[PDB]
Amino acid sequence: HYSRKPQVSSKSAKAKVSDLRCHYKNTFETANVINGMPLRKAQQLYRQVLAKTRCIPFKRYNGKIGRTAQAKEWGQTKGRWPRKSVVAMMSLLKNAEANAIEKGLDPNQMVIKHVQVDQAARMRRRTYRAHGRITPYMCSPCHVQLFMSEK
Amino acid sequence: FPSRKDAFRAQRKGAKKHRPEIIVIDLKDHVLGRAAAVVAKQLLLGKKITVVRCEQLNIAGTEIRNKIKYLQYLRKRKLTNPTKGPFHHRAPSDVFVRTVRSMLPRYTKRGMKALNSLVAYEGIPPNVVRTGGRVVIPRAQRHVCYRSERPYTVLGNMCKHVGWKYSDVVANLEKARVEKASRHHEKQAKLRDAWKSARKEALAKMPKHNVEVLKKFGYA
Amino acid sequence: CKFEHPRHGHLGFLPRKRSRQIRGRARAFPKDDATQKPHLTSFMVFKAGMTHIVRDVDRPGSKVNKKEVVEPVTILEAPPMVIVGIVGYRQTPVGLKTIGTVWAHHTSVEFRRRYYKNWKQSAQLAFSRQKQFANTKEGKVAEARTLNAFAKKASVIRVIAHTQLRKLRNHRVGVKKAHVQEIQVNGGSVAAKIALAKSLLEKEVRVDSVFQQSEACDVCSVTKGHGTEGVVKRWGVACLPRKTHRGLRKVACIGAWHPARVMYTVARAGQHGYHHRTQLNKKIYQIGRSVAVEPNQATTTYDLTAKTITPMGGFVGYGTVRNDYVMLKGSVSGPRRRVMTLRRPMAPQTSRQLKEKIVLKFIDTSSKIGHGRFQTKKEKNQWFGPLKKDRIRREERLR
Amino acid sequence: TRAGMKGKVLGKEKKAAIIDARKKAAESRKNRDDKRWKRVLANMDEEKRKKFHGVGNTAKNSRVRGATRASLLKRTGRKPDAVSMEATIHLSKLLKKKTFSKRAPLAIKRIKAFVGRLMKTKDNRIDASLNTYIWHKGVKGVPGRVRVLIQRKSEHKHFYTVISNVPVASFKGLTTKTVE
RNA sequence: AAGUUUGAAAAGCACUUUGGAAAGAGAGUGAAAUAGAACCUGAAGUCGUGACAAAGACAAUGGAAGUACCUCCAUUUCAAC
RNA sequence: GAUGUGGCCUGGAGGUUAGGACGAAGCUUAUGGCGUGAGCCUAAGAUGGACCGGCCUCUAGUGCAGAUCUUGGUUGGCGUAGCAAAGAUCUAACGGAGAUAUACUCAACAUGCAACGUUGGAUACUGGAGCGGGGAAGGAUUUCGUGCCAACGGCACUCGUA
RNA sequence: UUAAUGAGAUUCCCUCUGUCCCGAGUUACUAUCUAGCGAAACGACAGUCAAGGGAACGGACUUGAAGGGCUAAGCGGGGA
RNA sequence: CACUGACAGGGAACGUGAGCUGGGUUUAGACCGUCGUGAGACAGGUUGGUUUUACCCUACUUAGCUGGAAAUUGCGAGAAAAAGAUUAUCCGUGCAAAGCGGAGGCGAGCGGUGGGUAGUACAUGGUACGCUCAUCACC
Ligand SMILES: [K+]
Ligand SMILES: [Mg+2]
Ligand SMILES: [Mg+2]
Ligand SMILES: [Mg+2]
Ligand SMILES: [Mg+2]
Ligand SMILES: [Mg+2]
Ligand SMILES: [Mg+2]
Ligand SMILES: [Mg+2]
Ligand SMILES: [Mg+2]
Ligand SMILES: [Mg+2]
Ligand SMILES: [Mg+2]
Ligand SMILES: [Mg+2]
Ligand SMILES: [Mg+2]
Ligand SMILES: [Mg+2]
Ligand SMILES: [Mg+2]
Ligand SMILES: [Mg+2]
Ligand SMILES: [Mg+2]
Ligand SMILES: [Mg+2]
Ligand SMILES: [Mg+2]
Ligand SMILES: [Mg+2]
Ligand SMILES: [Mg+2]
Ligand SMILES: [Mg+2]
Ligand SMILES: [Mg+2]
Ligand SMILES: [Mg+2]
Ligand SMILES: [Mg+2]
Ligand code: NA
Ligand code: NA
Ligand code: NA
Ligand code: NA
Ligand code: NA
Numbered sequence A: 001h002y003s004r005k006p007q008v009s010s011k012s013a014k015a016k017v018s019d020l021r022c023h024y025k026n027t028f029e030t031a032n033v034i035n036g037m038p039l040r041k042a043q044q045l046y047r048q049v050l051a052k053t054r055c056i057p058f059k060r061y062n063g064k065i066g067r068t069a070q071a072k073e074w075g076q077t078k079g080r081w082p083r084k085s086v087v088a089m090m091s092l093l094k095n096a097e098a099n100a101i102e103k104g105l106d107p108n109q110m111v112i113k114h115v116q117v118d119q120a121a122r123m124r125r126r127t128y129r130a131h132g133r134i135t136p137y138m139c140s141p142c143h144v145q146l147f148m149s150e151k
Numbered sequence B: 001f002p003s004r005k006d007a008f009r010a011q012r013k014g015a016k017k018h019r020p021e022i023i024v025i026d027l028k029d030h031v032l033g034r035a036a037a038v039v040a041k042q043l044l045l046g047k048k049i050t051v052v053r054c055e056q057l058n059i060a061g062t063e064i065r066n067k068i069k070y071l072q073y074l075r076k077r078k079l080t081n082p083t084k085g086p087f088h089h090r091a092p093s094d095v096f097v098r099t100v101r102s103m104l105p106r107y108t109k110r111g112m113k114a115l116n117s118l119v120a121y122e123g124i125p126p127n128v129v130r131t132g133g134r135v136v137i138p139r140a141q142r143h144v145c146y147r148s149e150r151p152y153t154v155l156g157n158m159c160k161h162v163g164w165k166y167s168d169v170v171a172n173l174e175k176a177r178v179e180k181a182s183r184h185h186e187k188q189a190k191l192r193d194a195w196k197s198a199r200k201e202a203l204a205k206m207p208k209h210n211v212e213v214l215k216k217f218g219y220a
Numbered sequence C: 001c002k003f004e005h006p007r008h009g010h011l012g013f014l015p016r017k018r019s020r021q022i023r024g025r026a027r028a029f030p031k032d033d034a035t036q037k038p039h040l041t042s043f044m045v046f047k048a049g050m051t052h053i054v055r056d057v058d059r060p061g062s063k064v065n066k067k068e069v070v071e072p073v074t075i076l077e078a079p080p081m082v083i084v085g086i087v088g089y090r091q092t093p094v095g096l097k098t099i100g101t102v103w104a105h106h107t108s109v110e111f112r113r114r115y116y117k118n119w120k121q122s123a124q125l126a127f128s129r130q131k132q133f134a135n136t137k138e139g140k141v142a143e144a145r146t147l148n149a150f151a152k153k154a155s156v157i158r159v160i161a162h163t164q165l166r167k168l169r170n171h172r173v174g175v176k177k178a179h180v181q182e183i184q185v186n187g188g189s190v191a192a193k194i195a196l197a198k199s200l201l202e203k204e205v206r207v208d209s210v211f212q213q214s215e216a217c218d219v220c221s222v223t224k225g226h227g228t229e230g231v232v233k234r235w236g237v238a239c240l241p242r243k244t245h246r247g248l249r250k251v252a253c254i255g256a257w258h259p260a261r262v263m264y265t266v267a268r269a270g271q272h273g274y275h276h277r278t279q280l281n282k283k284i285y286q287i288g289r290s291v292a293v294e295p296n297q298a299t300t301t302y303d304l305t306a307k308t309i310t311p312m313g314g315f316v317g318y319g320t321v322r323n324d325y326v327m328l329k330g331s332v333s334g335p336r337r338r339v340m341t342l343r344r345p346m347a348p349q350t351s352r353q354l355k356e357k358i359v360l361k362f363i364d365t366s367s368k369i370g371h372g373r374f375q376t377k378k379e380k381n382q383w384f385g386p387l388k389k390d391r392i393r394r395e396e397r398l399r
Numbered sequence D: 001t002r003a004g005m006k007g008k009v010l011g012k013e014k015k016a017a018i019i020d021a022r023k024k025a026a027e028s029r030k031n032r033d034d035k036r037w038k039r040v041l042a043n044m045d046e047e048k049r050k051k052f053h054g055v056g057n058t059a060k061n062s063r064v065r066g067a068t069r070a071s072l073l074k075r076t077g078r079k080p081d082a083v084s085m086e087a088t089i090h091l092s093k094l095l096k097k098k099t100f101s102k103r104a105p106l107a108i109k110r111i112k113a114f115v116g117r118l119m120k121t122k123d124n125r126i127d128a129s130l131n132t133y134i135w136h137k138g139v140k141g142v143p144g145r146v147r148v149l150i151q152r153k154s155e156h157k158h159f160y161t162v163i164s165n166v167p168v169a170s171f172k173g174l175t176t177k178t179v180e
Numbered sequence E: 001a002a003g004u005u006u007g008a009a010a011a012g013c014a015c016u017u018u019g020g021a022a023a024g025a026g027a028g029u030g031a032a033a034u035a036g037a038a039c040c041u042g043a044a045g046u047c048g049u050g051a052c053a054a055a056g057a058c059a060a061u062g063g064a065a066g067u068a069c070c071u072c073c074a075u076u077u078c079a080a081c
Numbered sequence F: 001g002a003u004g005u006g007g008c009c010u011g012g013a014g015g016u017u018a019g020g021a022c023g024a025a026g027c028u029u030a031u032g033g034c035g036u037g038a039g040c041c042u043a044a045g046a047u048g049g050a051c052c053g054g055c056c057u058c059u060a061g062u063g064c065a066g067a068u069c070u071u072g073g074u075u076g077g078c079g080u081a082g083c084a085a086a087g088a089u090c091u092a093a094c095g096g097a098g099a100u101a102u103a104c105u106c107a108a109c110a111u112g113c114a115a116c117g118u119u120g121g122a123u124a125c126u127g128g129a130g131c132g133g134g135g136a137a138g139g140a141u142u143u144c145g146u147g148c149c150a151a152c153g154g155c156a157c158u159c160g161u162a
Numbered sequence G: 001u002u003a004a005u006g007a008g009a010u011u012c013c014c015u016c017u018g019u020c021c022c023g024a025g026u027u028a029c030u031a032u033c034u035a036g037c038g039a040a041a042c043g044a045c046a047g048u049c050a051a052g053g054g055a056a057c058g059g060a061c062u063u064g065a066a067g068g069g070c071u072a073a074g075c076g077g078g079g080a
Numbered sequence H: 001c002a003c004u005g006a007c008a009g010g011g012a013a014c015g016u017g018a019g020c021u022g023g024g025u026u027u028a029g030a031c032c033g034u035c036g037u038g039a040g041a042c043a044g045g046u047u048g049g050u051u052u053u054a055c056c057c058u059a060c061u062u063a064g065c066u067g068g069a070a071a072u073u074g075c076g077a078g079a080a081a082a083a084g085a086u087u088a089u090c091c092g093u094g095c096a097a098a099g100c101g102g103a104g105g106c107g108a109g110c111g112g113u114g115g116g117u118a119g120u121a122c123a124u125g126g127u128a129c130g131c132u133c134a135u136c137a138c139c
Helices: A024-032 A039-050 A069-074 A083-102 B004-013 B032-044 B063-074 B092-101 B109-116 B155-161 B167-186 B189-205 B208-216 C109-113 C128-134 C137-153 C190-200 C231-235 C377-384 C388-397 D007-042 D046-051 D091-095 D100-119 D128-135
Strands: A012-017 A110-119 A123-129 A133-139 A142-150 B022-026 B048-052 B058-060 B118-120 B152-154 C042-056 C068-077 C081-092 C095-103 C156-162 C180-186 C216-222 C225-229 C270-273 C282-288 C325-329 C339-343 C360-363 D083-090 D123-126 D145-154 D159-165 D177-179
Touching: A012 A083, A024 A083, A024 A110, A024 A142, A039 A083, A039 A110, A083 A110, A083 A142, B022 B032, B032 B048, B032 B058, B032 B092, B032 B109, B058 B155, B063 B152, B063 B155, B092 B109, B092 B118, B092 B155, B109 B118, B152 B155, B155 B167, C042 C180, C042 C325, C081 C137, C081 C190, C095 C137, C128 C137, C137 C190, C156 C190, C180 C190, C225 C231, C231 C270, D083 D091, D083 D100, D091 D100, D091 D145, D100 D123, D100 D128, D100 D145, D100 D159, D123 D128, D128 D145, D128 D159
Parallel strands: B022 B048, B048 B118, D123 D159
Antiparallel strands: A012 A142, A110 A142, A123 A133, B058 B152, C042 C068, C042 C339, C042 C360, C068 C325, C081 C095, C081 C156, C156 C180, C216 C282, C216 C339, C225 C270, C282 C325, D083 D145, D083 D177, D145 D159
């Protein structure tokens, strides 16, 4: 169901969300940064992004965005604070933690090992342009899948 | 300046202090273009070459002819942005490096390796002085290349008139080098003389048939 | 075939980029004359503000000869510097290389904070191993060898000097880490330079030991910054007519068709200000002593009123001049509070103007807030007399 | 902070020991200089003694030359969970040249930020009296000064502040006070 | 415009678990849920991810000859051969 | 430009030979072999689920890279341009999943942000040629109550002419 | 030829002024940075120059000279 | 006409319109003269007559981050360095001289940091200095 597999499935917990209705590019950036992190470290990072003391590094979906000093810890100059993607990913991580607890695993030891964000099917709206033109106004939702493994 | 990894690995390996096979050329009274051509061909053949005393290279013609040539070269510059334009180097060793570079396929990796095998100095710096006997290029020497009635220029004088500001430094350093080397040569005259007399007496001490063998091959 | 005028701006001050440093740094020192006595060539100061003076002019042939003139001046606070090191330079065919550094046995906390971003929360280990080593016999031998190398190979000797921000007890200069600069020793033989420098070690140098009153100096400083600026302010190009579609404050033509690219000589918007400048031939009008030693700083032989160099209400945004100071004629690049370097002049000092002996008759100390009309607080007191609040204060005093 | 100064890394004891070590070093310097300057001043002559101004902490209305002002501060300890203070805020210094239609909402935000920094609280509630006072001359006529009553309380433990207006006839001579 | 063309049967996913919900993780049905509902097959193009190859700036692609490393490929040989 | 080819290829027909649930067609390929080439054939699918190959002859709507080609889908630009006329909201309480949402250390700040509807209060605007109260034309349930927030109300919603 | 009338065309004078000499300072809304939302045009392939030839003005070709990679804000020389 | 030292001549797609401006030229309205039977014409006069788009690449201007000499790799070793049991096996000086001067432990030396005390110096709160006890190192 996932593009990869945990090395040990008895010591892993999975979670995914489909047609998320967050921006795909922002969610890509937000989810990719936690890929190899401990679960608690990732949750603290998201909580601090909501407090705007740390930022999400924006790599590959950063065309003409602002520069910030908070991107330096990631080796970048460009970063943002996408609260909608962040809260969606916090919900996803809570689900992963719940799956781990049900399996009898300690969430304090789980390490995120796999994060994949994909472009879901787009929803169509329209916008009205000068000289009686109608031009598309699309929404770009995303799929997210992840699993984490006990260290 | 080696990295700490390089020094640590050499320390682990137990290898000795290494020096590649390097030819040192004394370019004093050498024709600029001919020496450049010979050196370039040897660099494409894989040789590692250090040239010293580039300030005493020669060009045929009066100094003014060649200074005007340099000034003509100097006015070539990218008008819309002189940074990234042709970079005009005034130092004589830089001039020789450029002359050799124009005689190489500089826009290939092979030509770049060849150019990076060449080290050019003005005078003879202390790290080169004691590395071994320096060489000349006979087919590129002034005394066989120029008819001596013709005027010629010394590269360092032209360079200092077109912007090189290290002429006096190199002059004073070369004077000090020659004075130190001549003191070190006048001393050790007794050692050389002792070895000469030792060979002369060895002749009277060795077996006779060996002496005759030396005689027939021109060594005794 | 057109009407002609000169280009806008000086292509020799390119690029108009932000300066690498905030401090003014001399890029060259005066030509070293071995016939003169060994002497220092530079000093770091802090710009406090400006005022104006009256003096009589000694310039025969001028229409102002033996006549009073008023000159704006700049006041720069000059607390003494501390010499902490000696560096020697040897000349090579690729330029000067430093031979080594001889550090002082003891350094100030202010000098050592310059090696830290957060000194107060650091371990504060700077120069500790150096102290423990240099104190010994192997360290004494290493210092002797470095000094002998200076004697043998050096053509240039400079001292490492730093400022004293504790003595510059300024509330708006927030920096506490000392400013550090190399000061070149000119005059004498190299051995004499080394002897002067060795005597200077761990000692304080006052600005009056480097400069004399009626001389001129060059000033190395960085200009006030303005961020991004358009071509009108940044380059002085003309504004376009009111009728211009899409904007007036710009260069109409940034290039001919060929070359089919934009040249470096065309005015563009960008950084303006915060550039380093060297500003030669600033006449020293006064080298004052600190107010705690001589409080009659602005008193002259023609104005007997006891006053300090500080204007009524203080220098705006700066405060009180508490230390030695330098009065420079005219203006210098950069804002108040900025550290600057005074360098011994590089241009020839043989003109009548540059040799003129300066005698001040009046130094304005009126308020720099709002059309100051009182030289002293006593003058204002004798204009107004008893005010209501003074009467209330005395009423409280009597009870 | 850096790793060697982190609370969770050193622990209480080592953090306290390092802190006391730095303090005792500064204190040793201060006492040595105190004794040295006192005796050097004592064995000096009247001309020089007056020449030296307030070096050995002799002049009135001066700081203590020996140490910092914050090192002389008596640290009473933990402030209680519930605490009340009255303070003037100089609003006009914060609202200078602000867009006229934004002045009153900006004043509300600046007051919240001021109190939140003072009390280490993010939940800072505006009482009706203070909002009414701030807005009582329309959006652009915010008073230059306001006297506020700050009441921190608790309900982990959650801290919040209630900020209410203190009507005053004059602002002259009012400093920050603690109210029980 | 638009085949409802899931599957042989709806057997159309009880029940647990966390989530406000949508759903997720389990468990079940089924020969097969990469057969889970406008669901057979599921291409190209584009995108994500993991592993690897490296790589200055010669726009990239391309030709010809080698070489380094790989090779879920083919074929041959393995003793009087 | 002409012509030849027991030359290649595709959908059907008359024949003749085979294959397929022990897996047909289709689809995937660092998947090899064969052919000068058009292409053919094998292997492997950790693909698929029911038809179909070879050979002779017959037959045709029989071979694509481009026509500002037709239809569908995708795509860089791009999280970019921008969402700036009509002045404007603030505060508490309540409601709400929409929070005061935390690994260890940690008193609270520096680790759950931002946003809602109602009532009260404050502030402002419309300024009677009115974002007032009623009619024609046009529209036709948009009216009302309760509920609910998938989509829609180019931001948001607990709200709505949904 | 014509008084009166004219968002008709023209010249001069008084007044007046940032039209100009010659620019400077301030405001609102933008741009700019953030949250949410999110297009289009255009798009052979791509983009550093000099000269040379060449369909007689090259990003590609010949010979030289430059060129470390990635980015934010602008800008209108070129992309005939 | 006037100032001035002088008011030289040219090129850059007759440089430069996504830089402007739009007076001229060059659509449609209209008047005149001449021409034409006429519709209409004029190389003649006259008046009125939409100036669009940059967010891409490069160039230029400023503004950030960052690898890298085998220009990312090789382990592929070159110092504008020293001068020796082959840089090992001491330090200074001197010409790459002649020589010349220092160089199991305890204790000692030399110092770095803390106590006591004593002037003094420096711009005068903060460092250095003499004597003694402590520790620390190196020898
Ligand atoms: K945004
Ligand atoms: Mg933008
Ligand atoms: Mg519209
Ligand atoms: Mg319309
Ligand atoms: Mg030049
Ligand atoms: Mg400023
Ligand atoms: Mg216009
Ligand atoms: Mg043909
Ligand atoms: Mg058919
Ligand atoms: Mg057809
Ligand atoms: Mg074709
Ligand atoms: Mg935008
Ligand atoms: Mg109103
Ligand atoms: Mg109405
Ligand atoms: Mg919406
Ligand atoms: Mg009219
Ligand atoms: Mg009219
Ligand atoms: Mg103007
Ligand atoms: Mg913009
Ligand atoms: Mg060209
Ligand atoms: Mg082209
Ligand atoms: Mg352009
Ligand atoms: Mg135009
Ligand atoms: Mg225009
Ligand atoms: Mg009109
Ligand atoms: Na089963
Ligand atoms: Na096709
Ligand atoms: Na906006
Ligand atoms: Na750009
Ligand atoms: Na007629």
